[PDB]
Structure formats: structure tokens, C-alpha cells
């Protein structure tokens, strides 16, 4: 979330991000229920004040409010005990901010969209364009190896895939800044469009992506002006799912087909709707490119044709326990690098050795029954030293 | 004795050369310069390697050769002429040694060699190390040849290895470039089935192997256990190995070390390996007298860990106690003489508990003189003088 990508960062990078035009507004509204009201208190405060008023400040009641707001904003280093008066900066910039100092639009967000995903599946037809394959491809989400032959998709991407818009992008944009540091981009300015929205080369690449992914169209010949899209400040169902294992999807789109078609076997496609069945094959097929039940649930949950939102639950109890128990049926071998110790002597002596390697990051398994410790080769300069010195003291 | 007085001052020289052993503060050219210490020790090392010299060529080679001296000397004896023959009496080295070629046709100048013109004793460091993939036992003996007192040995080298299915014995080819060292091992099925590990000798008993690695065969492993060498053997086993050693091994020596190398392994389960022996008569008696000041050490070292009682003290009124007064002991009758000797062995080692404060318990020194006041000695046909001196003690 973006409580948990602000409180990832230093406050250095913090004052500075705390521009005057929006950052202090968008930062603001993070704030869930009560930490608003304290900072409307001392935004007008030239003067700090004792912790112990905060802290009796809300009644017996509901005080778990009051500790996990005061750790957030003191996470977010709004304010310093100074012995709780605000950062100046940050007043002075909430002073300002505070009496001081498209129907088209959406259906192109969506198309532009649309491709995106046609791309990121293997579609034949799809918008080409080497900066977004690249940029898919470096997200974690996708690998080539080849540049010759179109990227396949990993694990990851088919997980990506079956998520909902909001989250699938708002995933996609935190990668892209954490790809834009890596890059060399300054995170900062590129951070402050996004809040200001909601309301130099860098920005003007920046703002290419953006439109790229289709969250602006400025319209005009790529001009100075930007008119963003709904997806930029941040629907009825199609799928009807019988008792059977068939799936009847009132789907136009050759997205949603696709997906579909991801962990189910196709049958019919009528023109206005497709039919496919859920079968072991199709749903073992998806659960070893990557994807889990839960995915799959709830995609075909939140794509849920109104006929079937009477019933409780929308989803049959025995589509979902089937396909849980089809993803239950399949358990996978895993990768590891180590080392293993033996003739450990004393107990006691066993017990000191164990918390060397948990410490240092190169412990794996432990037995404590047969003196057995598994020591990564990365640490074993390390962990054999502390041995003999350990030998040495005897 | 000998290896602690090699390693302590030089060594000792059987069969000199006339100075040929100058590590030493008086000449070994006649009786009378020797310290009396070494003359001891020469006796006791003369002794020893005529065990070894019995060990390469056998007991009754061996008493053939002292029958063909005696029998020289006999014929010898009855003699009038003035030493043309009355010289047949007197033994040497090379005539000792031309008889022992006589009666057996081999000759044991390399043995001679070794541990007699040499004056050394040997020390082996041994630590082993178990291949689960290729199923080898991966022993790394070294020796420490550049103490004063010691030796190299290059000759070969038994080690008994017990294993789950059985007691396997293996002859090592220790040179001197040598450290590693593969012997194969054999299966586990005894573990599959619940079937009883044969030992040394015929017979077999059953295990708890709760405390045994789950994919290692070996139990216990003896580096030279026949004594075959001028030794002294460090070997690094766990502790699961030592405590079936001293619980399950037919050898006394190995049951002695045993519990010389549990004083480093304060675990409960030592506890119970030493508490096991002490409580089982046919065990060899000079064992769980050792067990006593072994668990002493043990009991000294986990307090503040220590559940129950004293140690010994329950054992003492279970063994040597009436049934139904446990603080007044039984009245005296030594007639079993090893539970005499365990008896009047308990409480000597039993005084060295001791209390966090570093002072012996007063539970322990109440016992002690109880059984000073309790003893009646009107009974038996035996003297109560060294039981009464050991309470002293």
C-alpha cells in the first residue's frame, strides 16, 4: 500500500518528497481516522508540547487508535518530540495547502489497458513497444532470455494476470518507481505527479510511460497540457458458473477469454458468450505455471454474473472445494545451498553453535536431537572460526 | 603409569647400549644410579612388552620359550664343571631372542626394536566422521610425535567398530604420511525391525535407540581396544556412544574409558548411563566404583539442574539399607565382597557433592554420620576396619 511505501523511506528523502504544491495533502488523507484531527490541532502551534497530553488525550476507550496513530505519524516523522510540535516545513507547506500560498477519457484507459494485458499474454496482435517490453520484462513479472523470440511469461505474471485492475496496477506503478530508482530516475519528482494528479527529461519520460500505460492522453500532439484518465487518480460481472464445472461468460473481449481459457478448457464461443469447463487438466495446468485457488476464486467471484449474486455464497460450494482440493493435491520439490556438521560431543556445547548461524543469516535446518546443523557455503568462513574459537575456550 | 611417567620425565630404556639415554638426571648403566621411580617403571614396562611379545607370537609359543630356559638352565644346573656349562643359567637378549626363533620361526626385531632400544611411548588423536552417501566410516588419526616422551608408529593399527549390525574389527595401515582412513560399514536394518545388536562376544541385548543418530549405523568405536601398542588414545565420539559403551560393551577397559570420558558430558542421560551401571550387579565391581566418583563429578557440575535427591544417597538406602527404615543402615555382613567394597565406596565419593555455596550439603553429612552412629559389626565374620576408615575418609 502507499502507507507502506511512504513509512520505506528515510527522512531525508521524506522532507524533501513533502512538497508544497500536494505531497502534504495526499500524505494527509492517508491519515485513517484521528491523526487528521492532531494534525489540524498543531498546524497553527509555534510551540511544542508534553507527550503525556497526547498520550490522555483520548480517553480509556479505543486507545489502541491513539498508539498505532501515533507510531504511523512518527513513522512518518510529521512531527519530533524536540525534549510534539510539527516539522516546519511540513507546516508551512499544510498552511499553504490550507487557505495559504471524459467518458472517452476512461474507455482509452481501458483499451489501452486491454493491450497491455493482449501483450503481457501471448497474443499475436498486440501494441509493440521495446521500452514497455523491457520495462515488463525487468518488473519481475516477465523474462526472455532471447531477444530474438518474443519474452514468455513466468510464475509471477500469471499471478499478476488474474488480479483485479486496481490492484494490478497499483502493483505495476510500485514496481515502476522501484525499476525508476534502479534506473536512475529521481523518485521524488516522479512521486509528486502521482499525488498531484489526484487532485524536465525525467517527468517527460515519466509521463510517457504513464500515457503508455494509459492512465493520461494529453491529446494534443503530446502537448504541456494532460487531461488524466480515471485509473490515474488510483463493474457488473460476466461469468455464470453451474454446478457442473461449466463456466458461461457473456464476454466480447478477447481478454477475458483468454483468461479464462488460463485454467479452463474452452468449448463453444458464441458471439456474445463463450463456454468453457473447469477440468483437472486446465486448473492442475494453471497451478503449475504458478497461480493458487485462491486466484482463481477470486476472479471468478469478482467477474460474477448478477443471475448467480442471489445465491449465498455467489460460488458453489462444490466449485470451490473442488478446485482447493485440486490445488491441495499437488505438493513440489524446493532449492537450496548448504553444509553439514557432525560429532558435536556435548549438549549444552550444541545449543551456543545454533544461535552463531541464526544470527549471521546462513542458518537453514536444525536438529537438536542428532546435533545435525546445515551451514550455507556463503558463511562457512565464518561459522567454522567461531568453532575453533569456541574449541579454543573449551 | 608408564604413559604418564614417559610424558612426565623422558622415557624409560629397556636393553641400553653402552650415554645412551641422556633426557634424564642419572646414568643407566648399573642398578644402584637408578632413582627408584625409574626402576618401577622398568619393571612395569618390561612386563608390559612381554604382553606385547605374546600378542605377536602366541601364549603357548610363549611358555614354550620359558620352558626351553628353564630346561637349559635345569640341565645346566646339575652340572660339576666350573661354568663350562653353568653359564647355560644366565640369560641375554640375543639368546632370548635366537630361542624365541627357535620355537616359533619368527622374528620379532621389528617389535624389539620399537619399544624396547627405543624407549617411547605413542599418542593417537582420533576423530571419525560418518559417509552417508558411500557408506564409510571416515576415521582421521593423528599423532603427536613431538612431545619429549613420545614416538612415531608406523606398524598397523586395530579398531573395533560396533555397528547396529554386529562388532567388526579392522586393521589400519597407520605410515607416516597417513590421515585418513575408509572403512566400510555395513546395513541398519536392525533399526527397521526391532531385532537385538550382537556384541562382542555371542550374545545380544536390546538397545534403546532413541538416543542413536538416524543415519548412522555405528555405536561405539575403540581405537586400538586389545592394548596392543604403548598408548594413549584420545578418541572424539558423542555422547549417545559413550554412554552405550559403558552400558552395553563385555570389556572392562572400554567401560573404564568410558566413564573417564562422560566427566566431560554432564547431560541427564550420563546421569542415567552412570546410575545404570552403579545399580547393576554383573557388572565388574571396580567399574561402579569408578561410576561413583564419576557421577560425583557429573552431580557437581549440573547443580542447579538437579531435580530429586543427592546423588547415590536414594541408591545407597535402595542397595545397602533396611527396607523399612531408610536412614539406619543394614547390619554389617561383608560376605558378598563386592558390595562390601561398593558400600564402603559410596559414601567417599558421595562427600564430594557439593551446594551452590560450594559447601557440602548438610543432607549428605547427616547421611555420612549416620552411618558412623548405625554400624553393628557383632555379626559378621569379617573385620570392620577399612569400611570404618573409608567413613573416616
Known amino acids: ?394 | 603409569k608408564i604413559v604418564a611417567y614417559e610424558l612426565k620425565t623422558g622415557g624409560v630404556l629397556l636393553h641400553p647400549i653402552f650415554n645412551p639415554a641422556s633426557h634424564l638426571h642419572f646414568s643407566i648403566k648399573h642398578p644402584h644410579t637408578l632413582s627408584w621411580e625409574y626402576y618401577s617403571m622398568f619393571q612395569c614396562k618390561a612386563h608390559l612388552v612381554m604382553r606385547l611379545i605374546e600378542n605377536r607370537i602366541s601364549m603357548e609359543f610363549m611358555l614354550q620359550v620359558f620352558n626351553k630356559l628353564l630346561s637349559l638352565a635345569s640341565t645346566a644346573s646339575s652340572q660339576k664343571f666350573q661354568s663350562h656349562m653353568w653359564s647355560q643359567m644366565l640369560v641375554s637378549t640375543s639368546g632370548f631372542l635366537k630361542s624365541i626363533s627357535n620355537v616359533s620361526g619368527k622374528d620379532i626385531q621389528p617389535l624389539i626394536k620399537q619399544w624396547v632400544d627405543q624407549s617411547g611411548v605413542v599418542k593417537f588423536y582420533g576423530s571419525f566422521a560418518f559417509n552417508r552417501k558411500r557408506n564409510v566410516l571416515e576415521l582421521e588419526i593423528k599423532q603427536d610425535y613431538t612431545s619429549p616422551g613420545t614416538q612415531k608408529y608406523v606398524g598397523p593399527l586395530k579398531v573395533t567398530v560396533q555397528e547396529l549390525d554386529g562388532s567388526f574389527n579392522h586393521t589400519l595401515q597407520i605410515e607416516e604420511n597417513s590421515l585418513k582412513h575408509d572403512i566400510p560399514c555395513h546395513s541398519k536394518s536392525r533399526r527397521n525391525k526391532k531385532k537385538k545388536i550382537p556384541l562382542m562376544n555371542g550374545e545380544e541385548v536390546d538397545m534403546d535407540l532413541s538416543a542413536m543418530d538416524a543415519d548412522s549405523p555405528l555405536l561405539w568405536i575403540r581405537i586400538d581396544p586389545d592394548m596392543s601398542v604403548l598408548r594413549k588414545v584420545e578418541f572424539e565420539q558423542a555422547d549417545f556412544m559413550w554412554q552405550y559403551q559403558l552400558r552395553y560393551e563385555r570389556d572392562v577397559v572400554a567401560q573404564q574409558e568410558s566413564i573417564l570420558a562422560l566427566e566431560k558430558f554432564p547431560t541427564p542421560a550420563s546421569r542415567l548411563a552412570l546410575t545404570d551401571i552403579l545399580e547393576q550387579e554383573q557388572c565388574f565391581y571396580r567399574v561402579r566404583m569408578s561410576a561413583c566418583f564419576c557421577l560425583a563429578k557429573i552431580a557437581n557440575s549440573m547443580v542447579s539442574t538437579w531435580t530429586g535427591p543427592p546423588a547415590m544417597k536414594s541408591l545407597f538406602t535402595r542397595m545397602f539399607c533396611c527396607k523399612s527404615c531408610p536412614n539406619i543402615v543394614k547390619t554389617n555382613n561383608f560376605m558378598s565382597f563386592q558390595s562390601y567394597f561398593l558400600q564402603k565406596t559410596m559414601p567417599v565419593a558421595m562427600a564430594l557433592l557439593r551446594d551452590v555455596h560450594n559447601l557440602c550439603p548438610k543432607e549428605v553429612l547427616t547421611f555420612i554420620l549416620d552411618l558412623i552412629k548405625y554400624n553393628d559389626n557383632r555379626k559378621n565374620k569379617f573385620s570392620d576396619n577399612y569400611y570404618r576408615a573409608e567413613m573416616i575418609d
Not at chain 1, 104 to 127: Q, T
Not at chain 1, 268 to 295: C, D, H, K, L
Open chain 1, 1 to 394: 500500500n502507499l502507507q507502506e511505501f511512504l513509512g520505506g523511506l528515510s527522512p531525508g528523502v521524506l522532507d524533501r518528497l513533502y512538497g508544497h504544491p500536494a505531497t502534504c495533502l495526499a500524505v494527509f488523507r492517508e491519515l485513517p481516522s484521528l491523526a487528521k484531527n492532531w494534525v489540524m490541532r498543531m498546524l497553527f502551534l509555534e510551540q511544542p508540547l508534553p507527550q503525556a497530553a497526547v498520550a490522555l488525550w483520548v480517553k480509556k476507550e479505543f486507545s489502541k487508535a491513539q498508539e498505532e496513530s501515533t507510531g504511523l505519524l512518527s513513522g512518518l516523522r510529521i512531527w519530533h518530540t524536540q525534549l510534539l510540535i510539527l516539522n516546519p516545513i511540513f507546516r508551512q507547506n499544510l498552511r499553504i495547502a490550507l487557505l495559504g500560498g471524459v467518458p472517452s477519457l476512461d474507455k482509452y484507459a481501458e483499451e489501452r489497458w486491454e493491450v497491455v494485458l493482449h501483450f503481457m499474454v501471448g497474443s499475436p496482435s498486440a501494441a509493440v513497444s521495446q521500452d514497455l517490453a523491457q520495462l515488463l520484462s525487468q518488473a519481475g513479472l516477465m523474462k526472455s532470455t532471447e531477444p530474438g523470440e518474443p519474452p514468455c511469461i513466468t510464475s509471477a505474471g500469471f499471478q499478476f494476470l488474474l488480479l483485479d485492475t486496481p490492484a494490478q496496477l497499483w502493483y505495476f506503478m510500485l514496481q515502476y518507481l522501484q525499476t525508476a530508482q534502479s534506473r536512475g530516475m529521481d523518485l521524488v519528482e516522479i512521486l509528486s505527479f502521482l499525488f498531484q494528479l489526484s487532485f524536465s527529461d525525467s517527468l517527460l519520460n515519466f509521463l510517457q510511460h504513464l500515457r503508455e500505460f494509459g492512465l493520461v492522453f494529453q491529446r494534443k500532439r503530446k502537448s504541456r497540457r494532460y487531461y488524466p484518465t480515471r485509473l490515474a487518480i488510483n463493474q457488473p460481472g460476466f461469468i455464470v458458473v453451474e454446478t457442473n464445472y461449466r463456466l458461461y461468460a457473456y464476454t466480447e473481449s478477447e481478454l477475458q477469454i483468454a483468461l479464462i481459457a488460463l485454467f479452463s478448457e474452452m468449448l463453444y464461443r458464441f458471439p456474445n458468450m463463450v463456454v468453457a469447463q473447469v477440468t483437472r487438466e486446465s486448473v492442475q495446468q494453471a497451478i503449475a505455471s504458478g497461480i493458487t485457488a485462491q486466484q482463481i476464486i477470486h476472479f471468478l467471484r469478482t467477474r460474477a454474473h448478477p443471475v448467480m449474486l442471489k445465491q449465498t455464497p455467489v460460488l458453489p460450494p462444490t466449485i470451490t472445494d473442488q478446485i482447493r482440493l485440486w490445488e491441495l493435491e499437488r505438493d513440489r520439490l524446493r532449492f537450496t545451498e548448504g553444509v553439514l556438521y557432525n560429532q558435536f560431543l556435548s549438549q549444552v556445547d550444541f545449543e551456543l553453535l545454533l544461535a552463531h548461524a541464526r544470527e549471521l543469516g546462513v542458518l537453514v535446518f536444525e536438529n537438536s536431537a542428532k546435533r545435525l546443523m546445515v551451514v550455507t557455503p556463503a558463511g562457512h568462513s565464518d561459522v567454522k572460526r567461531f568453532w575453533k574459537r569456541q574449541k579454543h575456550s573449551s
